[PDB]
């Protein structure tokens, strides 16, 4: 429950935040690190930041693949929507904290049964008017 010390068993499980960007979002979408580890539950704060480098406002509405393959379900980002890139005016600095961990429920089902490097492949590529 945006904390996990019932479930923080020892697996220092590595995670690989695959941030990507293309024309469609002309924003300096910085990952904080490529990757982290969490003790399967360890609520770590990882920010994200986006400077809008269009010379016009853009939207953002960026697609992802929230999984290495099997898992994704077990990707404990915060719920309630809040990846708010949405829209920015030309020069505006979006930044937000995310708090994150891997669910140790990953080490339960046949689905995963071996999967342990979580990744979210984020693709900032919706639409620019012109940068």
Counted domains in the chain = 1
Cβ–Cβ under 8 Å, residues 45 and 24:
no
Q: Which two tokens stand for residue 63?
A: 């697609």
49, 123 in Cβ contact below 8 A? Answer: no
Query: Residues with Cβ < 8 Å from 16, sequence gap 6 or more?
Result: 34, 35, 117, 118, 119
**CATH number, domain with residue 98:** 2.60.370.10
User: What are the two backbone dihedrals, phi and then psi, of residue 107, each rounded to the nearest 5 degrees?
Assistant: -85, 60
Is residue 21 within 8 A of residue 98, CB to CB? The reply is no
Q: Which of 21, 73, 70, 23 is nearest to 50 (CA)?
A: 21
Q: Which of 71, 60, 52, 79 is nearest to 122 (CA)?
A: 60
**Which structural domain range is residue 39 located in?**
1-131
């Amino acid at each position: 429950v945006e904390q996990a010390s019932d479930l923080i068993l020892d697996e220092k499980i590595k995670v690989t935040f695959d941030a990507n960007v293309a024309a469609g979002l002309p924003w300096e979408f910085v990952p904080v690190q490529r990757d982290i580890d969490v003790r399967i539950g360890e609520t770590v704060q990882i920010m994200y930041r986006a400077k809008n480098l269009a010379s016009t406002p853009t939207t953002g509405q960026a697609t992802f693949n929230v999984t290495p393959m099997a898992a994704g379900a077990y990707f404990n980002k915060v719920q309630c929507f809040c990846f708010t890139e949405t829209t920015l005016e030309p020069g505006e600095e979006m930044e937000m904290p995310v708090v994150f961990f891997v669910d140790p429920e990953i080490v339960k089902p046949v689905e995963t049964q071996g999967i342990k490097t979580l990744t979210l492949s984020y693709t900032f590529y919706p639409r620019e008017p012109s940068k």
